[PDB]
Amino acid sequence: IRKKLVIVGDVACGKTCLLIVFSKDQFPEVYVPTVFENYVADIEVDGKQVELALWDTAGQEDYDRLRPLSYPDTDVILMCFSIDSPDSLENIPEKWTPEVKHFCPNVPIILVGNKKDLRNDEHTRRELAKMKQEPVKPEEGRDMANRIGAFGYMECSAKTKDGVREVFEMATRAALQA
Ligand SMILES: Nc1nc2c(ncn2[C@@H]2O[C@H](COP(=O)(O)OP(=O)(O)OP(O)(O)=S)[C@@H](O)[C@H]2O)c(=O)[nH]1
Ligand SMILES: [Mg+2]
* Structural determination approach: X-ray
Residue range of the domain that includes 161:
1-178
Distances (CA, A) of 2 to 50, 69, 111, 137, 166: 6, 20, 22, 35, 19
Give CA–CA dist 103/178, Å, rounded.
18
Question: Residue 30 belongs to a domain with what CATH number?
Answer: 3.40.50.300
Complete DSSP assignment for 49-90? EEEEEEEEE--SGGGTTTGGGS-TT-SEEEEEEESS-THHHH
Between the CA of 38 and the centroid of ligand 2 the distance, in Å, is 11
Cβ(124)–Cβ(167) under 8 Å? no
Between the CA of 12 and the centroid of ligand 2 the distance, in Å, is 7
**Number of structural domains found in the chain:** 1
Q: Quick one: which of 78, 73, 75 has its CA closest to 56?
A: 78
Query: Ligand 1 pocket, 109 CB below 6 A?
Result: no
Alpha carbon dihedral 145, 72, 9, 119, in 10-degree steps, equals 60
Between the CA of 163 and the centroid of ligand 2 the distance, in Å, is 19
User: Which ligand places an atom closest to the C-alpha of 78?
Assistant: 1
User: Which ligand places an atom closest to the C-alpha of 31?
Assistant: 1
Distances (CA, A) of 41 to 18, 123, 176: 13, 35, 16
Query: Ligand 1 pocket, 79 CB below 6 A?
Result: no
Spell out where the chain has E strands: 2-9, 36-45, 48-57, 76-82, 109-114, 152-155
Which residues are 28's β-sheet partners?
Answer: none
Distances (CA, A) of 107 to 63, 92, 99, 178: 23, 16, 13, 9
